[PDB]
Every structure is written in structure tokens, then in C-alpha cells.
Write a protein that binds this ligand. Structure first.
Ligand SMILES: Cc1cn([C@H]2C[C@H](O)[C@@H](COP(=O)(O)O)O2)c(=O)[nH]c1=O
Ligand SMILES: [Mn+2]
Ligand SMILES: [Mn+2]
Length: 174
């Protein structure tokens, strides 16, 4: 199975570990088998117990109030692991999301191993940069390059972004 994944967070750090002190607020993952979307996805919004930084809010528009009644990462971790285990994770700038995932997994104090020990990790941004050296390779740039619709992406969304990346990646490898 190939799982195309994306996450939205409360923000990120420009110095040191990018995830330190921040939290995942949305996880969006799409399943692809034999180069075909199966339709069986994973999508959750999470309660961070901290505020979303202004910069981050300017990107996804997810309000603090909307997350108050959501599950915590700890409450979705088991099913999340059951969903991704053994698959090839396809993520645009993989180190970003994997960093947050391993960070959140570590806070659970359950001795959960690193994601890349039970999942194969493919950085689709590295793949794109290799195929299109010297060109723009943001997800939006790739959407234009492969004629994928991102008109509903004024504000980024984890599932929205994962779905778009799935289409882009299938075309890139098609
Ligand atoms: C693009 C961008 C993302 N981020 C963080 C917070 C977002 O929820 C997360 C999602 O990035 P994404 O929409 O590119 O997948 O990255 C920032 O802090 N500042 C930015 O300028
Ligand atoms: Mn992303
Ligand atoms: Mn996103």
C-alpha cells in the first residue's frame, strides 16, 4: 500500500528541531493500491492544548475554537499506526511531517519506534526536485505542471493537500 500523507500544525521553529513545542492539529492520509485511489482514507483534527501561531493560521485557517472538542493525538495514535504500518508513506518534504509524527509518538511514552522503522518513507519533494532540477517544485507548482485542480486550496488542509499530492504523485510516476 502507498499512503500519501500530509499534516497541519500549530506552526514550526526556524532554529533547532522544527517541531519542538508545537503540535499536529490535522492528519490527512490517502490510500493508493496498484496506482489507484482506494477511497479508504484517514482524516482527523486534533486538540493541541496550545494556541495556533498567526503564521500557521494564515496558511490553514484552522481556528483554536474548532479544535477544543477534538480528540488528542494519544486517542488516535493506535488507529493511525494501524493505518500506516508497512506502507510506503509519500509526503511532500517528508522530514517535516515525519518529524512531527515521531515527536508526537514519543510524547506518548509508549516506546514507539521511529516511523521509518515500520514504514518506507518517500519524500515527493526530493523526487520532484530530481525530475525538475532548477524549477519550482512546491505542491502548487506541481499542480500547474500536471494540470491538477488546486482551485479549492486558497487555504491548505491536510486531507485536501494529501488528495492533491496523491494525484500529482501518480502523474509524476505515471
Ligand atoms: C507554508 C507554511 C507552513 N507552516 C506549518 C504550519 C502548517 O499547518 C504546516 C502545513 O504546511 P502545508 O499546508 O504546506 O502542508 O506547516 C508554517 O508555520 N508557516 C508557513 O509559512
Ligand atoms: Mn505538508
Ligand atoms: Mn498541508
Amino acid at each position: 500500500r502507498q499512503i500519501v500523507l500530509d499534516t497541519e500544525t500549530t506552526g514550526m521553529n526556524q532554529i533547532g528541531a522544527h517541531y519542538e513545542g508545537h503540535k499536529i492539529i490535522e492528519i490527512g492520509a490517502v490510500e493508493v493500491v496498484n496506482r489507484r485511489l482506494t477511497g479508504n482514507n484517514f482524516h482527523v483534527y486534533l486538540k493541541p492544548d496550545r494556541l495556533v501561531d498567526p503564521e500557521a493560521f494564515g496558511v490553514h485557517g484552522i481556528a483554536d475554537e474548532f479544535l477544543l472538542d477534538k480528540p488528542t493525538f494519544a486517542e488516535v495514535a493506535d488507529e493511525f499506526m494501524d493505518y500506516i504500518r508497512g506502507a510506503e508513506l509519500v509526503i511532500h518534504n517528508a522530514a517535516f511531517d515525519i518529524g512531527f509524527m515521531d515527536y508526537e509518538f514519543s510524547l506518548l511514552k509508549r516506546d514507539i519506534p521511529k516511523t521509518n522503522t515500520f514504514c518506507k518513507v518517500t519524500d515527493s519533494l526530493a523526487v520532484a526536485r530530481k525530475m525538475f532540477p532548477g524549477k519550482r517544485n512546491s505542491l502548487d507548482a506541481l499542480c500547474a505542471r500536471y494540470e491538477i485542480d488546486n482551485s479549492k486550496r486558497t487555504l491548505h488542509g491536510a486531507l485536501l493537500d494529501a488528495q492533491i499530492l496523491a494525484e500529482v504523485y501518480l502523474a509524476m510516476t505515471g
